[PDB]
Subunit: 87 residues, 2 copies
């Protein structure tokens, strides 16, 4: 409804999957896959979900530490936003 509510929702969404393990401020490969399978599905990755998790991990992981922090997550979120904006 409000801009702030949406932002908190994005934050809580990320933490739901990131805090699944020891590394609570980042998404592991499996946690991302979990996220990619629920919150946005055939919408985005067109999931052959057992197959194309790896390519997406490498797209987002721009510092190459095998984990997806919130910033890297956000960059993807706002790319989709920027992309969907087309009417």
């Amino acid at each position: 409804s409000t801009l702030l509510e949406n932002i908190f929702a994005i934050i809580n969404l990320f933490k739901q999957y990131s805090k699944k393990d020891k590394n609570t401020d980042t998404l592991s490969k499996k946690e991302l896959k979990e996220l990619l399978e629920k919150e946005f599905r055939q919408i985005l990755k067109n999931p052959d979900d057992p197959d194309m998790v790896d390519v997406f991990m490498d797209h987002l992981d721009i510092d190459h530490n095998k984990k997806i922090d919130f910033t890297e997550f956000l960059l993807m979120v706002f790319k989709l936003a920027q992309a969907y904006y087309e009417s």
Copy 2:
């Protein structure tokens, strides 16, 4: 709510304010001012002249065309998300 609903909410929020004039795809100074007032509410109705729009305009208007496009707007949203991720 899903992520995709929140993304579209942010998109439609920008649109409802950007289309109040003939420049549908950008936010004017007036349109921007109303967005900031509604979305970021200064409860203390005390104005030592509050220019939230002018200071924001300088920060957000990268190309200096005195309009805020969606990408420029998303920069604001990006910063807020990062900040409140520390608050939680």
